[PDB]
From Swiss-Prot, chain B:
Domain of life: Eukaryota
The UniProt record lists the keyword rRNA processing: yes
Pfam families, sorted: U3_assoc_6, UTP6_C
Cellular compartment(s): Nucleus, Nucleolus
Organism whose genome encodes this protein: Homo sapiens
Protein name according to UniProt: U3 small nucleolar RNA-associated protein 6 homolog
Main function: Part of the small subunit (SSU) processome, first precursor of the small eukaryotic ribosomal subunit. During the assembly of the SSU processome in the nucleolus, many ribosome biogenesis factors, an RNA chaperone and ribosomal proteins associate with the nascent pre-rRNA and work in concert to generate RNA folding, modifications, rearrangements and cleavage as well as targeted degradation of pre-ribosomal RNA by the RNA exosome. Involved in nucleolar processing of pre-18S ribosomal RNA.
PANTHER family: HEPATOCELLULAR CARCINOMA-ASSOCIATED ANTIGEN 66, U3 SMALL NUCLEOLAR RNA-ASSOCIATED PROTEIN 6 HOMOLOG
Gene that this polypeptide is encoded by: UTP6
GO cellular component entries: chromosome; nucleolus; nucleoplasm; Pwp2p-containing subcomplex of 90S preribosome; small-subunit processome
Family: Belongs to the UTP6 family.
Quaternary context: Part of the small subunit (SSU) processome, composed of more than 70 proteins and the RNA chaperone small nucleolar RNA (snoRNA) U3.
Positions annotated as HAT repeat: 121-153, 156-188, 280-311, 458-490, 494-527
Swiss-Prot record, chain C:
Main function: Scaffold component of the nucleolar structure. Required for localization of DDX21 and NCL to the granular compartment of the nucleolus. Part of the small subunit (SSU) processome, first precursor of the small eukaryotic ribosomal subunit. During the assembly of the SSU processome in the nucleolus, many ribosome biogenesis factors, an RNA chaperone and ribosomal proteins associate with the nascent pre-rRNA and work in concert to generate RNA folding, modifications, rearrangements and cleavage as well as targeted degradation of pre-ribosomal RNA by the RNA exosome.
Compartment list: Nucleus, Nucleolus
WD repeat feature ranges: 99-140, 141-178, 180-218, 221-260, 263-302, 305-342
Superkingdom, natural source: Eukaryota
UniProt organism field: Homo sapiens
Protein name: WD repeat-containing protein 46
Keywords tagged on the record: Nucleus, Phosphoprotein, Repeat, WD repeat
UniProtKB/Swiss-Prot annotation, chain D:
Protein name (Swiss-Prot/TrEMBL): U3 small nucleolar ribonucleoprotein protein IMP3
Family note: Belongs to the universal ribosomal protein uS4 family.
SS bonds (residue pairs): none
Organism per entry: Homo sapiens
Superkingdom as given in the UniProt entry: Eukaryota
Summary of the function given for this chain in its UniProt record: Component of the 60-80S U3 small nucleolar ribonucleoprotein (U3 snoRNP). Required for the early cleavages during pre-18S ribosomal RNA processing. Part of the small subunit (SSU) processome, first precursor of the small eukaryotic ribosomal subunit. During the assembly of the SSU processome in the nucleolus, many ribosome biogenesis factors, an RNA chaperone and ribosomal proteins associate with the nascent pre-rRNA and work in concert to generate RNA folding, modifications, rearrangements and cleavage as well as targeted degradation of pre-ribosomal RNA by the RNA exosome.
Subunit: Part of the small subunit (SSU) processome, composed of more than 70 proteins and the RNA chaperone small nucleolar RNA (snoRNA) U3. Component of a heterotrimeric complex containing IMP3, IMP4 and MPHOSPH10. Interacts with MPHOSPH10.
Compartments it resides in: Nucleus, Nucleolus
From Swiss-Prot, chain E:
Lineage, broadest ranks: Eukaryota, Metazoa, Chordata, Craniata, Vertebrata
Subunit structure: Part of the small subunit (SSU) processome, composed of more than 70 proteins and the RNA chaperone small nucleolar RNA (snoRNA) U3. Component of the DCX(DCAF13) E3 ubiquitin ligase complex, at least composed of CUL4 (CUL4A or CUL4B), DDB1, DCAF13 and RBX1. Interacts (via WD40 domain) with DDB1. Interacts with ESR1 and LATS1.
Known tissue expression: Expressed in the endometrium during decidualization. Expression is down-regulated in preeclampsia decidual tissues.
Part of the intact protein present: 1 to 149 of 445
Modified residues (N6-acetyllysine): 49
UniProt family annotation: Belongs to the WD repeat DCAF13/WDSOF1 family.
Record function comment: Part of the small subunit (SSU) processome, first precursor of the small eukaryotic ribosomal subunit. During the assembly of the SSU processome in the nucleolus, many ribosome biogenesis factors, an RNA chaperone and ribosomal proteins associate with the nascent pre-rRNA and work in concert to generate RNA folding, modifications, rearrangements and cleavage as well as targeted degradation of pre-ribosomal RNA by the RNA exosome. Participates in the 18S rRNA processing in growing oocytes, being essential for oocyte nonsurrounded nucleolus (NSN) to surrounded nucleolus (SN) transition.
WD repeats: 64-104, 107-146
Localization per record: Nucleus, Nucleolus
Underlying gene: DCAF13
Name this protein carries in UniProt: DDB1- and CUL4-associated factor 13
Organism domain of life: Eukaryota
Amino acid sequence: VLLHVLFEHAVGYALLALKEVEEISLLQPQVEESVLNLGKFHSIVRLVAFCPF
Amino acid sequence: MAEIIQERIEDRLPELEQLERIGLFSHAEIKAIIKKASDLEYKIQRRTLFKEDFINYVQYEINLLELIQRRRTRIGYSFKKDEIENSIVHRVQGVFQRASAKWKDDVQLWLSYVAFCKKWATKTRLSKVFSAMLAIHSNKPALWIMAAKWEMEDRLSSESARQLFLRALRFHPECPKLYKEYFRMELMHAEKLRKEKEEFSEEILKGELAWIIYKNSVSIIKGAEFHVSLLSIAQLFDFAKDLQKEIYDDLQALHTDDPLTWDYVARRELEQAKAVEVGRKEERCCAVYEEAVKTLPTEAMWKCYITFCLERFTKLRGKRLERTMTVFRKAHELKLLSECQYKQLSVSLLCYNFLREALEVAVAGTELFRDSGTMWQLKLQVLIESKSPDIAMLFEEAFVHLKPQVCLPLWISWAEWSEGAKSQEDTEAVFKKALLAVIGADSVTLKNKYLDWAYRSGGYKKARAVFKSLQESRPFSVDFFRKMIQFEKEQESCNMANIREYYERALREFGSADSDLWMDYMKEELNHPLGRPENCGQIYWRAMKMLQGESAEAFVAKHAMHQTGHL
Amino acid sequence: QDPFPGPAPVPVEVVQKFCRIDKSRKLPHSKAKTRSRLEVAEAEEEETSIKAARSELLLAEEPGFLEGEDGEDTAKICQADIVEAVDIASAAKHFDLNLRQFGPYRLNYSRTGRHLAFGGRRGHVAALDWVTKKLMCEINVMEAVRDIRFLHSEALLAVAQNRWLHIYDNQGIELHCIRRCDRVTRLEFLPFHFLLATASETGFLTYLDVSVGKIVAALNARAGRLDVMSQNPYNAVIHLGHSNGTVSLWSPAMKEPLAKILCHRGGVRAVAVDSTGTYMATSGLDHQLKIFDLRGTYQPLSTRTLPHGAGHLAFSQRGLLVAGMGDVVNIWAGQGKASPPSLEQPYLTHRLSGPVHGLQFCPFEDVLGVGHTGGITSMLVPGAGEPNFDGLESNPYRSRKQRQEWEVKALLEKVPAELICLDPRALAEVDVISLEQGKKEQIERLSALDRFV
Amino acid sequence: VRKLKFHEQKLLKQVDFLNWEVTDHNLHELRVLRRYRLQRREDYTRYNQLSRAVRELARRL
Amino acid sequence: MKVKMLSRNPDNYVRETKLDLQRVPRNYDPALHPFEVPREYIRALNATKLERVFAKPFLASLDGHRDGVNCLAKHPEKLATVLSGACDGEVRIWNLTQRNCIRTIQAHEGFVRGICTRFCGTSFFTVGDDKTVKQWKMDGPGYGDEEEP
RNA sequence: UGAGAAAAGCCUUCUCUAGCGAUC
């Protein structure tokens, strides 16, 4: 499930890498905390590149 | 909590027990190391984290590594490096990685990580660090240079440094610093190839690969200073003089109508018989300037020539001045010369005891700029040096031309001259006219000099009359009351009532913010023979309430030092 | 050319302490499938024991000591000489409360050494932190008090009054009045089972589950009045002294004593066991102090005749034994390394204001608590307390949030009453009688005229 | 002591320190002591046991 | 005489600040931790009881087929994409994350007897009772265009 | 309703959120 996401913001372009995630049960009450909580989000997502305007 | 810290201490245990095997460290030393390691570990595993704890952890491990390194040489034991040193270095790398992940924006932490990787870590670990740095800090050209610098001077890979530079220009297309260092780097590569041939292709060895950088950088950045700058590095390399020759010729052909290029050619020509030869070179540099004037008649070109005359005069002296006086006249008729450079020549002429050209500069400045008050001050200083009897007419002509009423240095300067070579009554008349013309904050210095004159021209009685008249003109300074207090002190009477009366007026105006004035008042009651020391209780009480803010704290500290002998 | 190539060794004795396998067994196995599992089991055990050996360096404290010089005897050294020669922190732990208007006092320390509770004969009940000089509660029940004990944390304490058994909060609020337990003489709490054991005048031994609030067992000793009682912390069994000279081992499951051991020629009045559960100390009316080996042998290791009678006995965590005779306490010390205490000559002596009515050692401190008619005194006993405590089991320096987290963990882990046996490892052995019952079912499914006679 | 979590409550069900109704019946007794001020718990016991004797006589009769 | 008593430094055992966490020294001495066998047995017994408490296997049920489901085929490249075939003759593609049906196609007449996905994941193969083997495109048809094999 | 009711000052026990911590 390792993949790269391109996020476009007013300040600049950001490139991020995703390590692992529970894909099938993502839209469920308990697994949704993985993306909501900042600490759990840092566990699975990293910032590999940032290019400001 | 302590489970992670316990894991880390049990991970640290094997190298400590190996060190105890070595004989490098004693058992009590191992106990102390364990205690301090646990104490430092507890700080960085908390829910609230600070950077200084990570810094202290890193510093402690570095100090331990240095101590081990020093002791191993004395013992002579070089075995088991991997068991201890590599484990400590790996732990420090983990700490640095966590700290850099937590605080990405701190460049100083990144540079400290780079330094530690250089000193203690494998070159591939340092290679990974630069990629992490440039990924999120690509907007700083200096970081690109540092990465490219390490590849060339340390890793000896010219290929890696070239790609780092080429990619850097794509992020920063308009940075002149990136081009200059990239220009320098290729010339450094050429020297390594020349030294390569002597130990055992032709085009790069000629410096062609650096010349491609030259043409493109000039096209992108259309600037004379950047163009001249590339020549500066070019002259630094002894080989490929033709490259310097090609750059130098393109200076005049491509870059014209700008003063800087004509200046550089002039200075290039610059670089008892020897003094005659030195004098000969000056005219050739001087000669080039006129074609610069004839081709480019702009004002900015003219300052570059008069200034060039200035250092040679300040650096035989008669011949240098003969150049300056003629080119001053030539510029003056064309009226291109600006106000500031008139002063610089005239001030220069005064210092070397030559007093006639300075007058001509002074006259030319007043005619060209009548309204400028600085010029009228400049002219006045010349005739004071010359001692000519034209000072009186100078004040009449200056104030008539100066329609604005506020001319403070002129009003001051009229006072000292009138004291020197005019009657006493006229000096008082000038002062009274000055107080009428100047009404604002500039009147402060006028009043102080008026009171000082009264004591000198008259006696204490004259100062009293002037002080009484000026005691109500509210724009004041603390020097007004301090001067009057000193005058009472010098007189034989030393009436203490007048001393207190002057202090009360000063405290009324500036008592809210002046801590020194309150402290000076208190010392008068103690030290003066006619003073009453028992009043000091009330003065200290009054000082606290009137003083505001930090001034109140200053008075406490000053009084505390005064109670001791430090004063 | 490396002078010492091998890895760091670990002490064999230290590793043996962290060992739980019976190497003496000589079981034969001729199958490789059996062999593979056995070698892994030894591999698992050896690696765990090695890690704990390295962790010995993490221990930071050292036990106290006291040795004389120039041939002086430590018995004649008094408490005043100790106090001046010890730091200000430990000197503050020696104090003498004087409460004679009320009767003789019985005292109990909490399992964490921070808190102390005491009870007077005339009915004075108070609980206090003793490290700091603060009073948690101080109440006067109108009825007489025979014994005082803590229940798990300092929050709950139980008093054995004249009629019934009562439960109080640490701040003095009465919670329960248990009428089943009547005329109780002695109280003692089993920590890991949450059972409170009561000895009564009528001759009954009762077990109460404080976690649920129900009486799990009520046993008739059939030995008359019960006044001497103690537990073995290792074994979790209850010891009962009788006038016959015999000590009976009891468990809540059985209706009859586990064992009876004859120890004295007269009535036994005191009993105490060590924390490890190896040695048993008893005293009797024959003026004999006895030490028994409880590890399968039950023989008296040491014998000594005393001028006066040792009313009370106690054991510290390092193996020191104290006997209270009248108004004088005597402490015997031994090396304790796989050895009982030496009764040849006492270690320290002290004289109280009144006759001794109760003795206990603080868990993790080098102090001894003595209750008597005059009041309560705290002695200084160098080398009695165990130095390094576990933060997750009994932390003296624990916050309220740490305490409440531990209590839930203990409640999750409560041991049922029926599992108490003479062997704490009895659950590990296979039920041999149940084996053969299963095997039986397995088998089930699987001259010429002489002939005329 | 702390409010038990959902998983903790299932394992630690029926555990309550203050209320032991089956053993001492304190909550029922406390209402009697407060409603009619009784200095000693022993006085309530004598009333209760004597009340049983009156009822036991009536059922036998 | 020489005397020493245990004297814990409070700064070692008490945290420095309110922001700090409590220090927990650990001792592994077996004398301090008795009943290792009975205590661990209760924890294992509690673990099995908690396992039965939290056993909730059912997650969701997908509806939309109009006959009995006969075939299933998962997608090699994506976890959340599955393919199914009903006895009436239709083939449906499901999104496991969204729990809904993406596409519906009338592949065959009668039963569909087998469905397999090409290893690249851009096509699948279906078999029906009409003596026909059909290849389709996994990408959905554009706009409202009718799907063709 | 009936440790009557009402008001002030001290300890004890505990409940909610909200950041924060999990990136080596």
